[PDB]
Amino acid sequence: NECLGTIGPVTPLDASDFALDIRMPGVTPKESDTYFCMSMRLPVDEEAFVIDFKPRASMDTVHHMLLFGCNMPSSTGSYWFCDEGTCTDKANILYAWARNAPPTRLPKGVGFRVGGETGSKYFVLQVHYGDISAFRDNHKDCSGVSVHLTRVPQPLIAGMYLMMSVDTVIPPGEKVVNADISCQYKMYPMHVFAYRVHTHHLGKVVSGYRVRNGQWTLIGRQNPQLPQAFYPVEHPVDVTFGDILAARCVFTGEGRTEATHIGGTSSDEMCNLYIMYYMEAKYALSFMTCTKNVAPDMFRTIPAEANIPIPV
């Protein structure tokens, strides 16, 4: 309503569905590269399924938008700067939009489970504004995302497998440092349909693989300095009990003056790989994580592909 929109925060869509319009409350970025966050509580207490998204991004300023599910947003204000945090509990990523990135429309019969016993009670929207022009000091923006929710159970439930490196340091000036992550998979099958990579400025490339009986199958690989949206996996990759998930983040220590710790508690660097999957609903869970390298020896046999740069 802060930009004269008539659409309420909740619109029923027929018997069992509703749309949630999650939009900035008329914010004003005053400096380039500004991340704003806001929260939106789920109007239902029982479980519901997020089945579609529609981005409502302003023409020019907005570069990137992320949507998370969590139970405790970092603030109770109408908005906040995301540098304060997104959620104080675990922020579960559900959606990314980057201008000019490939979209990732959820496959048919797939939804994220929210609400209920296990599910997230809030969405948190992050909106990244890039360079802003002079003379926009009193402009109000209501960028965001509309979310389609249904109470109809979906046969396939979407989730996120988060791979993160926390054991590796980049010594200053070392041209190439690899951070390797690996975990055994021990659940019912997941089918990986998209992925997103995240590092700070020293990242060169991030790759994730499923390894089964010694064979490596690419899930995805990208340069983390490109827009951190979800890139679609052209052919979804099935990951099953007894497979290993393996990732390698390639970094540089060039230009650095001190050691740079990857995944440190006061970061400086990170390597995160977000693997968006679906699972058959009655066996599904909504998130899984790997924060170690259980099979470091395996990375001697890694495909040469994983070391090839994906420039600029």
Residue numbers in the entry: 45 to 356
Text lifted from the article:
PHM, a two Cu enzyme, catalyzes the stereospecific hydroxylation of the glycine Cα of peptidylglycine substrates.
As a step toward this goal, we have determined the structures of the apo-enzyme and three His variants at the H-center-H107A, H108A, and H172A, all without the addition to Cu2+ in the crystallization media.
